[PDB]
Amino acid sequence: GSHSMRYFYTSVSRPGRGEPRFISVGYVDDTQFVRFDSDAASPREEPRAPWIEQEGPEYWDRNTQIYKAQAQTDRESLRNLRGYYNQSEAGSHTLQSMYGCDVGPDGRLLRGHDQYAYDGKDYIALNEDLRSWTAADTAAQITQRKWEAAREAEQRRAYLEGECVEWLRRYLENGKDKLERADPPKTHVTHHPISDHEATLRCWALGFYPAEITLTWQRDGEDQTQDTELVETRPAGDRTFQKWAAVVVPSGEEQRYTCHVQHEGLPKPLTLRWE
Amino acid sequence: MIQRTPKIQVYSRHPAENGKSNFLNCYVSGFHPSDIEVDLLKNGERIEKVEHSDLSFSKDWSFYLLYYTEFTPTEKDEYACRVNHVTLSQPKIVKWDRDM
Amino acid sequence: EPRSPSHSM
Numbered sequence: 001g002s003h004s005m006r007y008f009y010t011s012v013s014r015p016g017r018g019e020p021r022f023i024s025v026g027y028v029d030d031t032q033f034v035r036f037d038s039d040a041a042s043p044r045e046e047p048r049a050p051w052i053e054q055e056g057p058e059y060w061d062r063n064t065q066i067y068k069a070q071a072q073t074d075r076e077s078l079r080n081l082r083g084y085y086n087q088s089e090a091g092s093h094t095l096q097s098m099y100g101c102d103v104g105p106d107g108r109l110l111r112g113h114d115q116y117a118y119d120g121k122d123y124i125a126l127n128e129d130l131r132s133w134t135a136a137d138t139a140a141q142i143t144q145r146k147w148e149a150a151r152e153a154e155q156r157r158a159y160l161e162g163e164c165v166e167w168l169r170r171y172l173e174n175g176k177d178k179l180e181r182a183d184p185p186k187t188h189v190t191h192h193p194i195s196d197h198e199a200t201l202r203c204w205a206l207g208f209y210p211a212e213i214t215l216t217w218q219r220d221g222e223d224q225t226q227d228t229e230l231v232e233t234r235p236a237g238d239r240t241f242q243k244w245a246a247v248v249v250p251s252g253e254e255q256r257y258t259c260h261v262q263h264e265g266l267p268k269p270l271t272l273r274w275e
Numbered sequence: 276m277i278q279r280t281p282k283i284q285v286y287s288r289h290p291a292e293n294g295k296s297n298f299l300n301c302y303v304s305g306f307h308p309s310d311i312e313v314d315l316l317k318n319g320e321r322i323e324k325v326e327h328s329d330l331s332f333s334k335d336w337s338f339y340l341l342y343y344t345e346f347t348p349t350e351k352d353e354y355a356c357r358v359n360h361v362t363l364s365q366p367k368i369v370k371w372d373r374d375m
Numbered sequence: 376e377p378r379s380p381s382h383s384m
Contacts, residue, residue, distance in 0.1 A: 035329040077384035120277025
């Protein structure tokens with residue numbers, strides 16, 4: 001189907017604690033496959049998925065150099081930005097970057113992204129044409145004039161149409177067993193008395209991939225979504241995810257309630273009852 | 276300068292069984308800025324050996340981290356997560372409930 | 376693989 005590759009960068013100034021920290025993470029779909037953290041001892045790009053480990057020393061060495069150069073460029077961006085906003089040298093500030101590509105089932109480019117936030121707010125973004133910028137305020141219009149003069153958009157486009165798509169396709173072949181395949185959840189229903197006559201029924205989906213999932217309670221086939229408590233999907237910590245959905249039911253009427261589980265890993269949606 | 280308040284979930288990787296090896300997870304999300312203190316607690320005291328995920332963020336630019344440690348649940352021992360962030364009036368403690 | 380750095384803001 002469709003696929004995505006993203007790099008997320010965070011640069012944080014820490015005046016009077018140390019030099020700014022730089023953290024990069026790479027993701028294919030919902031899977032983290034690399035990381036770089038400037039606070040690690042002698043920092044290097046490190047593998048976070050088994051299928052990337054086979055990349056040779058040139059891969060790791062060059063990417064490490066890229067992150068160190070990007071971290072330095074971000075330190076200069078942070079100094080420039082507190083210039084533009086006339087901000088104190090004593091404050092901690094945050095520059096975030098996100099970029100990458102979406103490809104269709106054919107492996108052709110659908111869309112490219114290259115966007116930034118300063119102190120939690122949209123700053124500048126590459127438009128869908130991958131040729132022009134949208135600035136959020138007059139500070140970002142400075143960056144925009146600079147980046148137009150330097151033809152930054154064409155540097156971004158070359159990555160998004162070239163290496164982004166070509167490396168994503170390589171990762172989708174090498175990690176196809178974990179990226180092209182879904183892992184269904186382990187499922188069960190638990191029973192939790194809350195008062196004298198009522199029980200919470202909690203429908204559990206554990207260790208599923210990808211994150212996208214629908215858990216629905218029915219009572220005698222009737223949708224109970226309006227009375228259902230859903231927790232935010234959460235990482236299991238092994239690359240898989242967790243979710244549950246809870247309804248309050250009358251004690252003894254539990255067999256009226258079906259939990260319906262929809263996930264790409266399930267050939268047919270599941271129907272579960274408290275047992 | 277946006278600030279966003281951390282959401283917290285405390286849970287085990289696998290369904291808890293007293294006496295069996297498991298992982299205690301504290302998932303902190305929707306926060307800004309990234310400076311944060313997260314501790315795992317046993318009977319209200321700080322566990323020394325805690326792992327964390329690499330800083331990442333969602334579509335609204337808000338950060339998330341997973342903090343975790345291997346642990347063996349018991350009937351009598353209480354586990355919790357303690358979070359401090361600039362958006363909090365004080366350190367927030369969320370207790371581990373094996374049923375959630 | 377990550378994109379090469381270019382200009383500062």
